[PDB]
Design a protein around this nucleic acid. Structure first.
Ligand SMILES: Nc1ncnc2c1ncn2[C@@H]1O[C@H](COP(=O)(O)OP(=O)(O)OP(=O)(O)O)[C@@H](O)[C@H]1O
Ligand SMILES: Nc1ncnc2c1ncn2[C@@H]1O[C@H](COP(=O)(O)OP(=O)(O)OP(=O)(O)O)[C@@H](O)[C@H]1O
Ligand SMILES: Nc1ncnc2c1ncn2[C@@H]1O[C@H](COP(=O)(O)OP(=O)(O)OP(=O)(O)O)[C@@H](O)[C@H]1O
Ligand SMILES: Nc1ncnc2c1ncn2[C@@H]1O[C@H](COP(=O)(O)OP(=O)(O)OP(=O)(O)O)[C@@H](O)[C@H]1O
Ligand SMILES: Nc1ncnc2c1ncn2[C@@H]1O[C@H](COP(=O)(O)OP(=O)(O)OP(=O)(O)O)[C@@H](O)[C@H]1O
Ligand SMILES: [Mg+2]
Ligand SMILES: [Mg+2]
Ligand SMILES: [Mg+2]
Ligand SMILES: [Mg+2]
Ligand SMILES: [Mg+2]
Ligand SMILES: [Mg+2]
Ligand SMILES: [Mg+2]
Ligand SMILES: [Mg+2]
Ligand SMILES: [Mg+2]
Lengths: 311, 311, 311, 311, 311, 311
DNA sequence: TTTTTTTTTTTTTTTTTT
């Protein structure tokens, strides 16, 4: 993590830097990621300044073709966050993977929110125990965040519940526009490097309501795509994992069919389908993954959150 | 509760404030919750004006990421409204929870309407007695609201009947559009802060009839989702509990199956299934709950409404 | 009761009224209850015309939240129609209550049609005698309406026989579609305000035949639900009582099981189950009631219709 | 009776009339009674054609609410067909009544078939002598029709036997599907208006065999219900009396229990139970009657068929 | 492959070569393909110099009309890169073809990224094994490149894993402008002649986000068209195969519709539609090819990457 | 065809002949068509020399008003080249006519390249077989020229494949300037008189990329107009048919819309729109034809190239 | 003269038999 202040010594005045920090650009990588057309929109920034900044940023970090062997070593930094269920972790290859977007969808009571709360605790577990040992950023759109539940789970893992709660940042996304604003501003908070997980529950809850009908569909997906693109951009640059929960819908024309359309399906690197099972058992199926094959596992929602049926 | 009049001092034209109030926005929080798009649709509100309003509202209340510990403290201000049955309260964690949507569905004569009447009285009980000590807003779609029943229950709890009735606001939702309108204008009435409960009995009664067939299914669910979203928005802002009763349907393709589809299931934070039992006993099962595990309890419908079998 | 003509002086075109009256909308209340989407269907009615009408209706009658105490006073206008059996009336709370749907189902020869004939006479009895002192609208689907029977009952009550017949309107529903059409056009007849009771005998007789099989089950219930919804609306506006007789069915999978499914069970506010007893005695049990507890009584079918065993 | 040909005057082309006549719709009343969705089922009939047919029929016959006094005069045309036993006639109110379905069930040798043959002769007797002076349509499923028996009875009543036989239309129902078809095409023969009685002997004999087991029980009743619906339907338009004989079954779980279930019990307007008596005497009990009280009478089977014990 | 240094001896000073080399012109062919107007844009390059360069370039390589027979001989240099599925290769005529742009589009989890990973291995296979025996350039826009997956596939083909990775160059396209910049300077790397394949996954991912709305649609396609044109230019000049993956979209107005519009469809020589099949089977349909007819094949995603269903 | 050597006899200096040939002038008709300003533009050409050359050319060929009968007799020399589809040839009036420019546009995979390849073979067929029996000049801008496809089509038509290929001249148009140069020096090759067809596929591919934005739109259209004018001049002079393939674009503001604008629309004498049809069927519609009325035909793309659906 | 975009949403019980 290199702060935009690093640009200052290369020859950029501090006055511009605040404009960059004003526009939500607190890291050098975010400078390279942002397009020149977008930087120009930043207030107090001219095309001459934008070009100057971009040239300076390249002087610090070089981006270009590199041998896949080198990209393998960089890939070593990725964390695998335990979901609390060893069977579910096995199919996922270790759990939720950082630097990528993971999505879970299914009917109600299927454990989507419960899994999010479990990740809030396990994420704080030290590496080699399924966790990344870092803070968690929680974005609530359903309104079901329960701090007591995290404390109860933390006790199951034998962690100080007060300490675990402190390492979780909670934001309530009142509407889609607010939800997008929260994500765009995560750059400053994440720049510290403490965070490891970003949870959006649920991704499409607000978008479903704000944009209604055929006419709004085109604008809805375009806004959602930019929202997803930013989330994916955040995950890669800060090495944090993005966990998204999604609803489902019934298809009268024709597992359950998720919502969000193709824009969400393409953006999500990993998608898991959660179904109700006999009694309290749940069935998780890995619909889409970049590195793991399709499989199913059985998990149970218990005191410790998501855990193995026997566990 | 901050009235929109607060924006007046920050520089909002008094004429505009009326438009907001005419637009059903009587609180500062409702301003932050409402999207900039929706505000523009308000008559006499220009896109330029909305910027000042939203910026002014932000000046008063700051919304952003906060430590989970702080959100835990804010969580303390939630009430738990006794359902009249101690056993049913135990599985629910204390009763119906404010800031969340609770839905009870089941076959006929299972006590859905009876439970709603019980909550009308218990809600008026002082806190530490299972109630919230506040007014109740009752929205009737079945047409079975019975003021005499509330009086009979109030005597069972040793409360003044006529005084108990005065604290209940009853609205008869003739059709789905009217039902949607009533919820929108609850902002003004709730702004006083006296109300503690909102009862919709039942949620899908009107939506079932207005939108008939698969052709109108998409429109029906879209309207219902916005209706449910507004109800959830009201509950969080005013710290009121939303209690919904729902019908059930027989599934020839395959506890009873509820109606409303996945839109209602996702929106509802808590769902209780009520079944007929031996004699006058009923069985309640907690299908979905953000914080409590699945459980079953037996309750009875007596003079005091919903009560324990022994009681 | 306010006719739609009252809408005219508020600014409604006289020509539009015929279109409204043509659509079976003869009262102001029916205007408010009817949704805008349905009004747009009416011939020669444009959305602007539909819009203008709605506010005009609003200017005449105000619909919104009101204190429960006020609703209690409105509830005072309810009528309780004697069923002829004092013991049966006691459990019912006084008899059949207007503004609610009452459904009696049971085996053959259980008196379902006998009560319908009894209600035809008692309804004409002046209030304080168990009646409503009003006309009766009788819709027949069984085909067992017997004007001679009503004359015999009337002589039992020392009422003028021919006078009693005059105040009864008889309609024979040939099929489900004709049955629904009769109900929709009751608005003009009920607008006079004389009618107190509406009798459908039996509700599901036609719906059973017209829609046969799994494929037509979904359409049958949807059509039935709209039919029941309209009946419930008629009772509320015109303060009439809706009395429904229903058939029963045997349940090989597992008191008799009624037909009509959950749609009928939810719609009906009160449901009485009639069984055969020793000799000519019958047993009536109150399965579902919004305001009275479960009870059983014994009644007899005699010269004066439904009567108490001793009576 | 008005033939569908009258529909020609109001604008129905002769081509369509044949299509209706193809579907067995030979009367104006049958057009009104038949549902629109059923008419569209007719081959070569479009919804527009079906629509045009209905209002054209409406212009001829008006169906709607009418004073019960008027319905009393229409009811005045009913016929009471002597059963041959004066005591049995008295309890029934005069004998079998047209426009209603009469069912007699009991053990073997109880006179069910003998009564059917007696009705064949008596029906031809002129009114004021117990008969309706009209033809008799006989449907046989037992296969026990005995034309020589009718001739013997006719001699007892002192009327011409061969002329008596000529006025009887006999059909042998080979299977349930054939039996249902015969009823549907009774409209053609009945349209003449000569017929007064319809005999089905026995109603459930064929249905019992064709649909065997609980698997087909649901389909059997649905088919039987539609079959009974038309029989009741046919009686009303043509003012003919439908006489049904039914078998009985022993009930190990627990007068004899009839077969056919509730579907037959509800549809049957009148039901008489026949039991064996001392010697050749028989006992008849009126289980269900829309207009007469329960009673028992003793009758004998003699040369003239069903006759009074002393007679 | 002729380097621009070859141009120097014809009379071009080394200093100018640096400017053209700086402008991404590293081969003699690139000089001829590049327009004079474009060369004038290069710094330190005057029109006189451009004319001198272009005339000198013609002195080395002459471009003009040639007999189709000669063109056939040159066409022999084309490679066919196996996609791993013999059935898929058969319809394609041998696999992916160099000197042309191949685009595979389809719904998520359809193997688009899997094919790209598979092509990374097979491309290193020696000729007559389905590969080109050359390096691979990988451009990532979704961010799903997985070096581990390449190693696992390499073992399936019995190739040294680390050796296969060393021969793959990976570049991460942060945004559309960066993606275009990578391609423009990609000429230098390809100049060595080792590379045989170029993978863009996905082509339209960035362009979708950077340019939003009808207002920016015109600019988006123009930039995309220039991007595709350069890719096509690279493939022909260096005899490398360009493999592109594309997303799909739902068409509410009316096989899945791809994104990118007509600009992408025209530019792509070969287009394959990947569709989900029963279980693990996928269906590949050849929508557009210059030399092969439409066909469909079934392939599976296994440990060895894309493989035949039985394979 | 008359070469400039004919001019030399009348008194034209040989050096002037070499200069004019260097200026792309090899025929008397080219001398007459070229304006005196353009001729003076040629290096080493003086105004006196240009005047002398023009006067000598006029002395060889005289251009002036002639009777329409003579023009019809000359028009008799025109050929009609079969497109492979009998219906398409019929609608076109016999196929592609020489001395005119023909353009086909449509979506991808609509057979534009396939149609050009089919023409490449059919042109070699002798007269009365639909061909012109002459060499074909092919200019490629897409890059999809396929000698193998030409060989396969020739075998389908029963022609020697290598002989057919030898008679096809192929030029690859790297950029718009190169394409214009190739067209300019087509004159010398066409001087031989062997060629009958000139194919540009596609016309606007290079112009779309070289000139971008409304800023350069005017220059792009001017260059395209000069290009099309030169092509038409060549077609008229050498009695060859010019076949052009064009892309299409979507029109958000508002059969597909072609590109190239009014310049291309006016320049093209004939324009055929190709659309996708059910299965392998394609639909060709004659948008603009100087001599034939609008029509539609159906063709299929098979082994023999463009062929009729049944064939 | 130029340039396409983007999916949504479940419903409804029947019926004795010996
Ligand atoms: N005042 C009362 N005293 C006693 N019992 C009552 C009273 N009011 C209602 N009940 C009982 O409550 C039941 C009424 O059904 P209720 O409305 O509670 O069920 P529900 O689950 O809401 O079903 P539905 O939605 O179909 O009405 C009956 O069992 C009735 O006896
Ligand atoms: N006018 C009358 N005088 C005396 N008793 C009568 C009279 N009308 C009917 N009854 C008696 O009352 C009963 C009639 O029952 P009713 O017709 O109400 O049955 P139901 O259960 O409604 O029938 P269904 O099976 O058609 O629904 C019979 O037992 C009959 O003897
Ligand atoms: N000609 C006759 N004279 C007198 N009695 C007769 C005559 N024919 C038949 N019977 C009597 O009438 C009855 C005829 O049996 P019937 O066909 O009526 O039986 P059921 O009860 O209708 O039906 P099933 O026997 O098939 O169950 C017997 O009791 C028989 O003795
Ligand atoms: N390494 C792997 N091992 C096994 N199966 C895998 C592997 N990688 C992916 N899969 C399977 O292949 C599918 C995903 O393929 P892929 O990622 O190519 O999809 P895609 O259609 O390209 O995705 P997108 O929607 O992002 O464009 C899933 O069913 C997944 O289980
Ligand atoms: N030998 C062949 N026989 C038949 N069809 C073929 C053959 N080779 C290729 N095709 C078909 O040719 C089609 C492509 O047609 P073509 O490229 O001419 O279209 P177009 O209208 O020029 O569109 P675009 O300019 O966008 O490529 C593909 O659908 C492919 O299946
Ligand atoms: Mg949740
Ligand atoms: Mg994906
Ligand atoms: Mg209720
Ligand atoms: Mg939920
Ligand atoms: Mg018999
Ligand atoms: Mg009956
Ligand atoms: Mg992918
Ligand atoms: Mg193409
Ligand atoms: Mg092409």
């Amino acid at each position: 993590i290199l702060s935009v202040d690093e640009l200052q010594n290369y020859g950029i005045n501090a006055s511009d830097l605040q404009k960059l920090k004003s526009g939500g650009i607190y890291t050098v990588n975010t400078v390279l990621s942002t397009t020149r057309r977008h930087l120009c929109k930043i207030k107090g920034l001219s095309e001459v300044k934008v070009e100057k900044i971009k040239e300076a940023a390249g002087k610090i970090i070089q981006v270009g073709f590199i041998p896949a062997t080198v990209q393998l070593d960089i890939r070593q930094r990725v964390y695998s966050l335990s979901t609390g269920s060893k069977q579910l972790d096995s199919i996922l290859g270790g759990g939720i993977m950082t630097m990528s977007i993971t999505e879970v969808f299914g009917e109600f009571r299927c454990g989507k929110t419960q899994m999010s709360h479990t990740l809030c605790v396990t994420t704080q577990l030290p590496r080699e125990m399924g966790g990344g040992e870092g803070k968690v950023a929680y974005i609530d759109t359903e309104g079901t965040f329960r701090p007591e539940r995290i404390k109860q789970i933390a006790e199951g893992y034998e962690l100080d519940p007060e300490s675990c709660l402190a390492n979780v940042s909670y934001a309530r996304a009142l509407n889609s526009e607010h939800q997008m604003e929260l994500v765009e501003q995560l750059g400053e908070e994440l720049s510290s490097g403490d965070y490891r997980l970003i949870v959006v529950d649920s991704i499409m809850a607000n978008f479903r309501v704000d944009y209604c009908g055929r006419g709004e569909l085109s604008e809805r997906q375009q806004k959602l795509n930019q929202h997803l693109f930013k989330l994916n951009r955040l995950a890669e640059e800060f090495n944090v994992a993005v966990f998204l929960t999604n609803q489902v819908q019934s298809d009268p024309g024709a597992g359950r069919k998720p919502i969000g359309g193709h824009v969400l399906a393409h953006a999500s690197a990993t998608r898991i389908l959660l179904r109700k099972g006999r009694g309290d058992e749940r069935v998780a199926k890995l619909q889409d993954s970049p590195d793991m094959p399709e499989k199913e596992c059985v998990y149970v929602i218990g005191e410790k959150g998501i855990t193995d049926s026997s566990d």
